[PDB]
Design a protein around this nucleic acid. Structure first.
Length: 113
DNA sequence: GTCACTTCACAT
DNA sequence: CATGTGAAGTGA
């Protein structure tokens, strides 16, 4: 069931976003992590049901929160990886796992860019 | 040859 | 349980 969970998600998502997320990372900035993540972020804050189901959103305009299990699902990237990226591209974990949720920030990460 | 992730298989 | 390691891929 941890797979079909993927289905409903990717599926109920606009083909463009998906497409985005599917492309391997190149030197192109809107192809590496941050962007890809961030597009979802702001996409979601636009369609609440999904913001709930996936569990990825802005707490403040500087900090945000997610259920890794789930974002790493949408992004087709394993959980392990997803964490590995978060610290590797320097994101700050500022509140240990609180029942699935975590909140984060990154100096360049915010509002819209 | 380099990036920028990815994943594993175990460690902490 | 949640997270991180180092080495070893893979295709931009």
């Amino acid at each position: 069931d941890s797979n079909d969970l993927e289905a409903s998600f990717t599926s109920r998502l606009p083909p463009e976003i998906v497409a985005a997320l599917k492309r391997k990372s190149s030197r192109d900035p809107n192809s590496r992590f941050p962007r890809k993540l961030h597009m979802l972020l702001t996409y979601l804050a636009s369609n609440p049901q999904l913001e709930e189901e996936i569990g990825l959103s802005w707490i403040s305009d500087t900090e945000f929160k997610m259920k890794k299990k789930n974002v790493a699902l949408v992004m087709g990237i394993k959980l392990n990886t997803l964490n590995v990226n978060l610290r590797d591209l320097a994101f700050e974990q500022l509140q240990h796992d609180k029942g699935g949720w975590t909140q984060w920030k990154r100096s360049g990460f915010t509002r819209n860019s």
